[PDB]
């Protein structure tokens, strides 16, 4: 509720009014402090969601994502204070302002009690990210990249706007509790499909499914490090949160209309993971891997099965923490080599031995190696999907088989092998990069002991 | 032009628009339109360049024709009803007659062809007056006579306004032509909701007023008229380019910025009126405005265009303008979404 | 207050102050021809405001303390450097000319602003209308690429059109062998190496172009060196014109009010100088331009608006 | 020379200025202090107590309360001999099914 919001927004005057060089320090202090307070919100009751007021409420689904976003907030500050050191204090302050303003919106939307209120800051997250990708992005095609990312989501979000207000004029309020209790069987009338399509496509776009995913490779690669993590670790997941919330009034229409997306997602994950097997760009390879994992959640959410929701929430968080880490891996390597081609800097393990380890559990976590939370996600989803149909395991398991090859492919090409002779600027890794990397992996294994925290309201 | 003469000329233009909004008699409505026209031309003639003369001539011909065509709508309504009161009129042909007569003054349908060109010829300050204040008078009549309008005829005029107004905007270099094409696009949004509920037709008006004051007076402060000229302003005053990109995003309608408030309420109303295809298409065309909005934002502040060594003098000196009401303009034009339920005050 | 519209309405006119000592006389000539010496003598003997030749740091002179700022911070060009390698690849030649054109264009405004606000005539060296003689000279030997002419002209019409021409122009006629005579006595090693061709190419463009086409809108009186030193002779000659041709003996308070609007706004007068046409000599990339701007901004006094810099001692910032 | 620009700056090594550099910022004293913040306010106060806080969080989802009720409920049910959990949930005796 408020105990998270005002501390987040009151953090903004601090960064603006802090000393010239202390900006990174005091921002990091209370961002971690905010994370601690958010963790206090992680508690949930049995069945009734933790409701605070007409404006804000939390459930067993929102809380794990809330603590994840606040937990993220220190990490971009940690990950960004290397390529922004040679910048004017105002621009550094502006950069920090963008992140916490972005993070502030995330707390708002996840705790939003009204769908329209959920909707207003659903796209409002775009404005800070658009600035981050465009201004501080370090590339040339970032301009076209920002346009692709911006227009795709709007093209899907605006139908939701017309759909959402239609609910208000037809079924009174759009309070999440009032929708759930007063749910009615959506008919099969040919208007209700376009009703169904509008209420779904908005979350489809910013949850890249095959076909509606070309923004993500352009979104991730040209975005700066902080932009890439926030976009891949939370931003691809507003779509996820919407579906678990909005599919309450899409049944039984979801039963019949689910087919085109399920085939698109299940086949897409094989295709996308195949792209990972032959990606020339390390950041792009990680980006395409996010599509495969996210497309798995598409099948998870859209099956509408108790087990499927549970594994979704497991992959909901685990992928986000993992994808942020892998982007950190690529970023921590990038500036040393000043290039994105994977084969540019081979045999890094012989030069940097600890990064060899950090890359190693990172690849293992993305492998869904048990008992990592990723395995709990994928394995739960497979069982739910298998109950839905026996055939899907052929597609399901094949993804894990492909996921194995490309995951260690980056490991062998970069970490193992012969070091590149020509390069000589690879310095011993700063303990900031090392500290940040453990900041990611350590909570992941810490979460393994308590899956019930992140299983969700279906748990 | 002598400032005292200039002040009076603006004073009559304001009063002429004020006269339209306060007249219960159709003849006086026409009086306000013509005497507002009678003093609009000299303001466009203040610079007195051959481009301005072409602009002023274009503006007068279309406005005089629309106003003269407006008389028959009054006369025909007179002929069939004998009522000079401005109310729900009593002739479909007369109702049709004035609707394009007023539309030409606003420039929504192909009628809109004068709107861009006149803005290009005349000065930035004059364009600000033309695209903001000169749109209250034609709107005032439409609000009063909204109950008599043919829904099909007005919705169409609104559609091509946002449709063409947004579509051609992708192909404009000069910022003045960009603003006019934005104006035509925004014209459709208010006009579309006009038959349904006039309350948020006004709400769109003051809000759309706010950015156009915000943008134009920002542009005047920049003293730039082209995209490239605007780009160089990052070197001189990077802060101004920062606010302009906020307004550019806001005028585009991205939440939670102010410009989203009109469009959101507009979609809500016609959705209540069972018209649900119509709002969807306008929202789709809304991104068309956002594109060249982004292109300007990309050129202005998001990127950093090359500058010229001659910019160094501009650093040494300072601006002498006072940009009155600029501080409160952009703030009221970018973050007012939380104060949305205040629209009932308009009712 | 200033000439803001309230001032003009309340009664502040322009024709009341100006008198017969209201002229835009320019003393001008070839390089080192002693025009600046004669310009001072006219200024002293007429009670007429003098304006020294606008250098690279003339704009620096107007702003702040008037101390010439760093060439990197103001000019990116050196006349001495242009002397060493007139055809340098860095574009020191055209950058010098364009900056010089801006400096004198600012000087022209400062003269008009003082003249209109005081009624006292102004004498300045090498008015902007005569600035083309150098660029023409720098074009004949290829000191600048051909395209520099069009850009310099393009700035000229979009700026010099509004600034109306002087009243009477003083020309110190000096032949090239004489120009080749004094510049040894000057001593500065950079100006020894000036080519006799350059001293020639300014001369004919001065002779066959500057004087005749501009003569139809103001009086022109040619003086050689002897009539240049004769301050008594030239000064009564200046007093002995009616000054009919030119726009000046036609306008009223309406134009002067508008003219003082543009000139008073120091951003507007050179607003069109930063024209967005891109050429290698004058265009500076984003990284270099941004870094210099930070270096300019971190300077004292320039951090905020004038009267708003606490570092120099602007007290009551919380109340201003 | 296209434009008067600056050459690409070379990436400075924080180590060669100060060998103990931690990569957080240039100035050594704040860099050492940034170490203290990122670890003390990172691993120390969040990971350690936060884990204990969430680990020792009170009954979440009533995972054990339901067990105790089930044990009592099942102990009641087979004692009387009726089936230990009915196939129906909302007692059909009240239900007023149409026709």
């Amino acid at each position: 509720m408020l105990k998270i919001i005002i501390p987040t927004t009151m953090l903004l005057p601090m960064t603006w009014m802090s000393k010239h060089n202390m900006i990174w320090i005091n921002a990091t202090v209370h961002s971690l402090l905010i994370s601690l307070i958010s963790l206090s919100l992680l508690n949930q009751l049995g069945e009734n969601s933790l409701n605070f007021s007409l404006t804000f409420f939390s459930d067993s689904l929102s809380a794990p994502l809330l603590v994840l976003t606040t937990w993220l907030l220190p990490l971009m500050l940690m990950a960004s204070q290397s390529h922004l050191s040679k910048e004017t204090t105002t621009r550094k302050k502006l950069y920090i302002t963008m992140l916490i303003l972005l993070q502030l919106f995330l707390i708002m939307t996840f705790t939003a009690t009204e769908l329209i209120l959920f909707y207003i800051l659903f796209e409002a997250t775009l404005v800070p990210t658009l600035i981050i990708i465009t201004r501080w992005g370090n590339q040339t095609e970032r301009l076209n990249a920002g346009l692709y990312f911006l227009f795709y989501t709007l093209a899907g979000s605006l139908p939701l706007l017309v759909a959402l207000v239609y609910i208000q004029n037809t079924t009174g309020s759009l309070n999440f509790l009032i929708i759930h209790y007063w749910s009615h069987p959506l008919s099969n009338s040919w208007s209700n499909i376009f009703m169904w399509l509008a209420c779904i496509m908005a979350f489809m776009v910013k949850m890249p499914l095959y076909g509606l995913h070309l923004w993500l490779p352009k979104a991730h690669v040209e975005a700066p490090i902080a932009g890439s993590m926030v976009l891949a670790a939370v931003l691809l997941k507003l779509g996820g949160y919407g579906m678990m919330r909005i599919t309450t009034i899409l049944n039984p229409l979801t039963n019949y209309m689910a087919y085109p997306f399920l085939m698109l997602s299940m086949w897409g994950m094989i295709m996308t993971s195949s792209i990972c097997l032959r990606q020339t760009d390390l950041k792009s390879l990680i980006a395409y891997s996010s599509v495969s994992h996210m497309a798995l959640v598409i099948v998870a959410i859209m099956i509408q099965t108790p087990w499927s929701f549970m594994g979704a929430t497991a992959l909901m968080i685990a992928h986000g923490l993992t994808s942020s880490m892998l982007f950190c891996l690529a970023n921590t390597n990038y500036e040393r080599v000043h290039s994105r081609t994977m084969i540019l800097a081979r045999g890094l393990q012989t030069l940097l031995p600890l990064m060899a380890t950090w890359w190693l559990m990172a690849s293992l976590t993305n492998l869904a190696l048990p008992p990592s939370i990723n395995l709990i996600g994928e394995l739960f989803i497979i069982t739910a999907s298998f109950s839905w149909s026996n055939i899907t395991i052929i597609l399901m398991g094949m993804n894990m088989m492909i996921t194995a090859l490309y995951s260690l492919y980056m490991l062998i090409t970069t970490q193992r092998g012969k070091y590149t002779h020509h390069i000589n600027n690879i310095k011993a890794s700063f303990t900031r990069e090392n500290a940040l990397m453990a900041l990611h992996i350590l909570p992941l294994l810490l979460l393994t002991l308590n899956p019930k925290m992140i299983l969700g309201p279906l748990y | 032009m002598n400032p005292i003469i200039y002040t009076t000329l603006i004073m009559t233009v304001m009063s002429g628009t004020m006269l339209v909004m306060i007249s219960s008699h159709w003849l006086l409505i026409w009086i306000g339109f013509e005497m507002n026209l009678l003093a609009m031309i000299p303001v466009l003639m203040k610079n007195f360049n051959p481009r301005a003369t072409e602009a002023a001539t274009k503006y007068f011909l279309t406005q005089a024709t629309a106003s003269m065509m407006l008389m028959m709508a009054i006369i025909i309504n007179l002929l069939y009803s004998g009522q000079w009161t401005i109310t729900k009129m009593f002739n479909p042909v007369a109702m049709t007659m004035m609707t394009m007569a007023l539309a030409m003054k606003l420039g929504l349908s192909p009628f809109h062809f004068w709107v861009p060109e006149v803005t290009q010829g005349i000065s930035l300050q004059a364009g600000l007056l033309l695209l903001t204040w000169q749109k209250l008078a034609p709107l005032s009549v439409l609000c009063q006579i909204s109950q008599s309008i043919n829904p099909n005829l007005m919705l169409t005029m609104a559609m091509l306004s946002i449709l063409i107004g947004g579509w051609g905007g992708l192909n404009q270099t000069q910022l003045r032509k960009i603003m006019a094409y934005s104006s035509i696009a925004h014209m459709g949004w208010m006009t579309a909701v006009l038959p349904y509920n006039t309350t948020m037709t006004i709400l769109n008006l003051l809000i759309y007023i706010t950015m156009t004051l915000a943008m134009f007076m920002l542009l005047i402060h920049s003293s730039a008229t082209t995209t490239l000229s605007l780009s160089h302003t990052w070197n001189k005053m990077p802060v101004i380019t920062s606010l302009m990109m906020v307004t550019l995003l806001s005028m585009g309608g991205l939440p939670p910025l102010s410009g989203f408030m009109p469009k959101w309420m507009i979609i809500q109303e016609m959705t209540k009126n069972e018209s649900i295809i119509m709002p969807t298409l306008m929202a789709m065309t809304a991104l068309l405005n956002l594109y060249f909005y982004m292109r300007l934002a990309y050129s202005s502040s998001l990127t950093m265009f090359p500058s010229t060594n001659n910019m160094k003098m501009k650093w040494q000196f300072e601006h002498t303008k006072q940009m009155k009401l600029l501080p409160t303009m952009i703030v009221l034009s970018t973050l007012v979404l939380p104060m949305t339920p205040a629209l009932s005050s308009l009712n | 207050l200033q000439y803001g519209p309230l001032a003009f309405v309340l009664g502040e006119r322009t024709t009341r102050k100006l008198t017969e000592t209201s002229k835009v006389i320019t003393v001008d000539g070839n390089i080192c021809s002693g025009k600046g010496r004669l310009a001072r003598e006219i200024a002293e003997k007429l009670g007429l405001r003098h304006f020294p030749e606008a250098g690279i740091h003339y704009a620096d002179s107007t702003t702040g303390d008037g101390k010439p700022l760093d060439v990197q911070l103001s000019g990116n060009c050196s006349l001495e450097k242009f002397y060493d390698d007139p055809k340098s690849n860095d574009g020191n030649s055209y950058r010098l000319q364009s900056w010089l054109y801006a400096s004198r264009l600012l000087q022209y405004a400062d003269a008009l602003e003082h003249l209109l606000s005081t009624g006292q005539g102004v004498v300045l060296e090498r008015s902007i209308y005569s600035d083309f003689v150098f660029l023409e000279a720098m074009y004949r030997q290829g000191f600048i690429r051909k395209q520099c002419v069009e850009h310099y002209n393009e700035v000229k019409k979009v700026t010099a059109c509004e600034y109306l021409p002087p009243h009477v122009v003083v020309y110190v006629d000096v032949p090239v062998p004489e120009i080749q005579s004094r510049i040894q006595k000057k001593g500065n090693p950079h100006e020894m190496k000036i080519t006799a061709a350059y001293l020639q190419d300014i001369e004919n463009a001065y002779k066959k172009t500057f004087l005749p086409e501009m003569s139809e809108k103001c009086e022109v009186l040619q003086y050689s060196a002897r009539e240049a030193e004769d301050a008594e002779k030239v000064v009564e000659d200046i007093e002995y014109l009616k000054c009919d041709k030119g726009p000046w003996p036609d306008q009223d308070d309406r134009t002067f009010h508008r003219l003082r609007m543009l000139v008073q706004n120091k951003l507007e007068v050179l607003n069109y100088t930063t024209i967005p046409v891109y050429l290698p000599e004058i265009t500076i990339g984003a990284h270099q331009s941004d870094r210099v701007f930070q270096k300019f901004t971190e300077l004292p006094g320039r951090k905020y608006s004038p009267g708003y810099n606490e570092d120099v001692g602007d007290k009551w910032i919380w109340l201003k | 020379i296209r434009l008067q620009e600056d050459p690409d700056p070379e990436d400075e090594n924080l180590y060669e200025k100060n060998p103990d550099s931690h990569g957080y910022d240039k100035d050594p004293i704040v860099d050492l202090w940034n170490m203290r913040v990122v670890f003390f306010f990172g691993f120390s106060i969040v990971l350690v107590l936060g884990s204990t806080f969430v680990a020792y969080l009170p009954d979440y989802r009533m995972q054990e309360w339901a067990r105790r009720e089930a044990e009592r409920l099942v102990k009641y049910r087979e004692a009387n001999g009726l089936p230990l959990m009915e196939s129906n949930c909302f007692d059909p005796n009240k239900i007023q099914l149409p026709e």
Binding site: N138 | S231 | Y278 | -
Partner: peptide
């Protein structure tokens, strides 16, 4: 350093129309 627009990007946005044709060529 991050890429910044140059005369290639500027002239792309410079002219009568960024979407030109033979009709708009003159």
């Amino acid at each position: 350093r991050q890429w910044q627009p140059d005369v290639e990007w500027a002239e792309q946005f410079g002219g009568a129309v960024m979407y030109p044709t033979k009709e708009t060529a003159h």
